[PDB]
């Protein structure tokens, strides 16, 4: 995130970090067993890190759960990034609490001009 601000710790409880030795992508928890992310973040093995704020320091709310299934959209196009969506099944269900929580899927598409919140541990 360029030009952002630091989120209040655990105020984005659906944000997860995808980890293969180090952070490489984000995702969103949509039920206790499933994270939605981008298909171009695919790796054959992924550890999902929930409850994170500082991804370099153990702060006490983390849950580290390895993926059991990783399903990219069948019509993902690696050249154009069309259909860039992926689902990750946790090998055990996350414990939902005040710092690890789900985000609702949309009930309709958002109008142009709608204010949104974007988050991540990407380059600043």
């Amino acid at each position: 995130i360029v030009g952002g601000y630091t989120c209040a710790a655990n105020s984005i409880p659906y944000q997860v970090s995808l980890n293969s030795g180090s952070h490489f992508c984000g995702g969103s928890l949509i039920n206790s067993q499933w994270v939605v992310s981008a298909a171009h973040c695919y790796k054959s093995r992924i550890q999902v890190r929930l409850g994170e704020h500082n991804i370099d320091v153990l702060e006490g709310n983390e849950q580290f759960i390895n993926a059991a299934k990783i399903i990219t959209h069948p019509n993902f196009n690696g050249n154009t990034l069309d259909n860039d969506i992926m689902l990750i099944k946790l090998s055990s269900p996350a414990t939902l609490n005040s710092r690890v929580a789900t985000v609702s899927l949309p009930r309709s598409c958002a109008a142009a001009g709608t204010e949104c919140l974007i988050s991540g541990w990407g380059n600043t």
Binding site: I1, V2, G3, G4, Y5, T6, C7, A9, I12, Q15, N19, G21, S22, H23, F24, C25, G26, G27, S28, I30, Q33, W34, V36, S37, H40, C41, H53, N54, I55, V57, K69, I71, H73, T80, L81, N83, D84, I85, L87, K89, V103, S104, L105, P106, R107, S108, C109, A110, A112, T114, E115, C116, L117, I118, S119, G120, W121, G122, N123, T124
Partner: protein, 98 residues
Amino acid sequence: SSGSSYPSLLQCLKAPVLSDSSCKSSYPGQITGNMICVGFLEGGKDSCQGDSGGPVVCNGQLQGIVSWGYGCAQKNKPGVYTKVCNYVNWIQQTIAAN
């Protein structure tokens, strides 16, 4: 772990959904119906490498997944996001059967 360039602490950004006409004009020949632009045409505020897969949440609903862009926070090159309101049935059916 954040490695050599990523921040340690989770970063946040408020940003508006952009019109499809602005999205297509920013990225001629590259925008499908499964993509939406979110951010600022003047640049300066945007998602970037390491953010992909993460959320764009509007009025409590996941509407976008960080996908791609030209550079980061560049003028007339807003972020391009997977349009989640195209995929609720794919998501729900995949979850239901797996």
